[PDB]
Structure 1
Amino acid sequence: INHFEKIQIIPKSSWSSHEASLGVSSACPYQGKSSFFRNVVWLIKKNSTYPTIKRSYNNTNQEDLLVLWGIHHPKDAAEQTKLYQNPTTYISVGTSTLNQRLVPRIATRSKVNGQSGRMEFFWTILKPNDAINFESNGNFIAPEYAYKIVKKGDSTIMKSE
């Protein structure tokens, strides 16, 4: 791959049933304030409720699309209900080929960047005319931006200081 074209597939504003603007951490600082990975949305409960999410995006572009998403693994049972209410959650992802179902694993973990929680990130290539389908109870790190693959050719990742 020689060129990506970033596009928005699921707007940040369109999460009218969940809190999409409080998904930040001191582990990801920006100009002295708590921030987060800009291309994905850390969704949490709104007014003490996390209703089931059911979102679909259809690849209407000519280009193959690289889609990124994630799952949050919390520190303990208290933090789970604190962020998402529901004690047992999941994320199910489907495409033409893909048939995924993720569940958050809870455990006591060492503090990296002052966090005992973890983020596990996943990806897929959504081919043209195919649709990706999400469903979740919580712990969902939703895509906002995905990358179009516009130019394919000779390239390499070169390790150098």
Structure 2
Amino acid sequence: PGDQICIGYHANNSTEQVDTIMEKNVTVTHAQDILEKTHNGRLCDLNGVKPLILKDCSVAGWLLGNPMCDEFIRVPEWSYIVERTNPANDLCYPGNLNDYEELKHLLSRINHFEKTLIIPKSSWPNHETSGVSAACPYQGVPSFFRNVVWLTKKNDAYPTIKMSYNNTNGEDLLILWGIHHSNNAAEQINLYKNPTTYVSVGTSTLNQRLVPKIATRSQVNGQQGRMDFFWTILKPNDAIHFESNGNFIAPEYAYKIVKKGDSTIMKSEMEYGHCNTKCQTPIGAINSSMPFHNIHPLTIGECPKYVKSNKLVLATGLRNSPL
């Protein structure tokens, strides 16, 4: 016969398959996937910061103080805001919030948040502050927004308001006010007694003049009237000046606000997970070092690149031989 020496290579039982430029379904001894497809399916903290989850509230109904919305507690700081796709309680009284989207972008990441009383109800000795509507119910009995005050005529008279609040706090203040639009002249007189009315607001940069549009509108939430709301950011040592003779929705509570980063609003229908993550998706959090993933496009955080791919399998072994 004769002595022999042979050159050969490794083989095992692996059925893992990779794809090359020239060949398809090539079995290999060892392979590694560089595509991430798994998540914990929970809402995690973003780098140790708890998200702000409004369970049955849109953002706007949360600042203004919707009566069916203050089931919440103090969250001094958050990394992103979690809204449901269609929150039940957006605006109990029909109307709009000006620059709502830009405001939502502002509050996506907040370093410090604190509700503060800036104008207590006692500061209207010659006005009625017990304004309450059936469109804003709390436990069935009609109520109103908890952070703004519906000013109504008192003793058959509406004295002209000339009020100023100075931001003595060392932080910026988010102040929200509004104007009530009536449906007819009789409602105007019965509520404010002054037929022609205005709401004028002024700061170092803001110069606003609002006049109600007394017109007929379709009923929403039981009311044909509307309440257009407005907001601004009051710099420290600055004062906001209010001058109105009717239809003024005065502010009661403000917000001490500090911003250091930026985020976005995440539309998700999941709850807290008591977990930390570097990347968050509406359907779960990702803990991976891989460069690519196919879990969800709407990501928040330091995330791998989104691709349309079932697998990206790299060949780390030899071409296997069948047994």
Indicate the TM-score class for this superposition, using the shorter chain for normalisation: over 0.9
Q: Larger Rg: 1 or 2?
A: 2
CA contact (8 A) 1:49 1:84 kept: yes
Q: Are residues 1:6 and 2:115 paired?
A: yes
Corresponding residue to 1:96 among 204, 207, 227: 204
RMSD: 1.0
What is the distance in 2 between the residues matched to 1:151 and 1:105? 36
Q: Are residues 1:156 and 2:282 paired?
A: no
CA contact (8 A) 1:4 1:151 kept: no
Question: What is the Cα deviation at residue 14 of structure 1?
Answer: 1.7
Q: Give SS of 1:13's match.
A: helix
Structure with greater strand percent: 1
CA contact (8 A) 1:40 1:69 kept: yes
Question: What is the Cα deviation at residue 154 of structure 1?
Answer: 4.1
Question: What is the Cα deviation at residue 106 of structure 1?
Answer: 1.0
Q: Are residues 1:17 and 2:126 paired?
A: yes
Question: What is the Cα deviation at residue 150 of structure 1?
Answer: 3.5
Q: Are residues 1:27 and 2:135 paired?
A: yes
Question: What is the Cα deviation at residue 107 of structure 1?
Answer: 0.8
1:42 alignment counterpart? 150
Corresponding residue to 1:63 among 171, 175, 192: 171
Per-residue displacement from partner, 1:29-64 (whole Å, max 9, x unpaired)? 001111011100000000110010111000111111
Q: Quick one: higher RCO (CA 8 Å, sep 6+), 1 or 2?
A: 1
Per-residue displacement from partner, 1:10-39 (whole Å, max 9, x unpaired)? 001221000012x11000000111101110
Alignment-mate amino acid for residue 12 of structure 1:
K
Count of aligned pairs between the two proteins: 160
Per-residue displacement from partner, 1:75-113 (whole Å, max 9, x unpaired)? 111100000000000001000001111000111111101
Name stretches of at least 5 consecutive residues in structure 2 with no aligned partner.
1-108, 270-323
Alignment-mate amino acid for residue 80 of structure 1:
Q
2:77 alignment counterpart? none
What is the distance in 2 between the residues matched to 1:106 and 1:115? 14
Q: Give SS of 2:179's match.
A: strand
What is the distance in 2 between the residues matched to 1:42 and 1:8? 16
